């Protein structure tokens, strides 16, 4: 049995790789190939962030980076910003033996009242990563903020603009034009906290988590390099959750080991059935053809 199946375009005839490589882009194809090799070999490096608007691809900040950002963000003097009284209630806690740091927590109100904890959005200034993670478990969502000159503002977009459960949402630094926190007032519906609604209110273009991989595919007629840029179709594992979950990570590892079992020859690898599109890439003076996998998923008996 094939290791992957098409989720669409099943009517297509199979095209051999040698024929694809001789043809002009853009075209769509069905293929059957062995996965000869892939990048990244270090699978933990496959998780990237991609902007749907400007097309940039970037790294997800390391956990250690966030830890440092939040440590560096410690403040002795957080503001409530009193003009925002109808938006949120606020509390500030003092500390012992923590260099006089303070934590401000702002509790966003739904329709004039504080909602249940699981429905409550928090804004936090001066919290550690560990505190933010705990708050994200007990409340609906956390937005890290800092005291600006006039209003509360998001931290640098290198920190998540929203943490909801264990999902860290990031914004594009090129495409966003940040609005201050008071603009959360423009949300008429605060009965749920939809990440894209928070993002629009704050002028953020959210980045999308993707698995990015380079598949070297071989059917014996030729070798074709095809990119995978997958949010959750291919592995049936959400790229937005994978970095926070040992079991999801283990599943991706097991899928890839299944495509390329160690110490056996390529003929003994499973076939991958894939749909691919070809397209033209220009990096200055010369043209190049590239290939991407679409409408393809891992099969049931892994």
């Amino acid at each position: 049995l094939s290791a992957t199946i098409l989720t669409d375009h099943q009517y297509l005839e199979r095209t051999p790789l040698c024929a694809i490589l001789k043809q002009k882009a853009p075209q769509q194809y069905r293929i059957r190939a062995k996965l000869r090799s892939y990048k990244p070999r270090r699978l933990f490096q496959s998780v990237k962030l991609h902007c749907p608007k400007c097309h940039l691809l970037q790294e997800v900040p390391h956990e250690g980076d966030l830890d440092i950002i939040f440590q560096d963000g410690a403040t002795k003097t957080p503001d409530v910003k009193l003009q925002n009284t109808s938006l949120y209630d606020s509390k500030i806690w003092t500390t012992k033996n923590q260099k006089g740091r303070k934590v401000a927590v702002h509790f966003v109100k739904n329709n004039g009242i504080l909602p249940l904890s699981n429905e409550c959005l928090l804004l936090i200034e001066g919290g550690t990563l560990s505190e933010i993670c705990k708050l994200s478990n007990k409340f609906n969502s956390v937005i890290p903020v800092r005291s600006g000159h006039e209003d509360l503002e998001l931290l640098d977009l290198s920190a998540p603009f929203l943490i909801q459960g264990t999902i860290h949402h990031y914004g594009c630094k090129q495409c966003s034009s940040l609005r201050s926190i008071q603009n959360l007032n423009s949300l008429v519906d605060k009965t749920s906290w939809i990440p894209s609604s928070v993002a629009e209110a704050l002028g953020i273009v959210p980045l999308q988590y993707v698995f990015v991989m380079t598949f070297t595919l071989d059917d014996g007629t030729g070798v074709l390099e095809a990119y995978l840029m997958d949010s959750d179709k291919f592995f049936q594992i959400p790229a937005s959750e994978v970095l926070m979950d040992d079991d999801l990570q283990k599943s991706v590892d097991m899928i890839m080991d299944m495509f390329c079992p160690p110490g056996i020859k390529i003929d003994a690898y499973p076939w991958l059935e894939c749909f691919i599109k070809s397209y033209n890439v220009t990096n200055g003076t010369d043209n190049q053809i590239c290939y991407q996998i679409f409408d393809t998923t891992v099969a049931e008996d892994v």
């Binding site: 853009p26 075209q27 769509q28 990048k39 990244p40 270090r42 933990f44 490096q45 990237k48 991609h50 940039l56 691809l57 790294e59 390391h62 956990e63 250690g64 830890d67 209630d89 509390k91 806690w93 003092t94 500390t95 012992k96 033996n97 923590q98 934590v103 927590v105 509790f107 504080l114 904890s117 409550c120 928090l122 919290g127 550690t128 560990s130 505190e131 993670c133 705990k134 708050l135 478990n137 007990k138 409340f139 990015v212 380079t214 990119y227 840029m229 994978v242 970095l243 926070m244 979950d245 040992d246 990570q249 599109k277 397209y279 033209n280 890439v281 220009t282 990096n283 590239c290 991407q292």
Partner: protein, 61 residues
């Protein structure tokens, strides 16, 4: 009061005396920290970008 309860819940997540604790680290997160000495795998964004014109031709198929 409910406000009081939310404030107590929030407080319970905070570490207000001495050093703060360590957030959980998954095996990929730990590995991402240890992968040194070779440029991290990436693909230039332009290699992944299918132009509007190419997308037009492709959608008609």
């Amino acid at each position: 009061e409910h406000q009081g309860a939310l404030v107590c819940l929030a407080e319970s997540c905070l570490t207000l005396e001495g050093p703060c604790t360590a957030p959980p680290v998954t095996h990929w997160a730990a590995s991402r920290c240890k992968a040194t000495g070779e440029a991290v795998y990436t693909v230039p964004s332009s290699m992944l970008c299918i132009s509007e014109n190419d997308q037009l031709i492709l959608s008609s198929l």
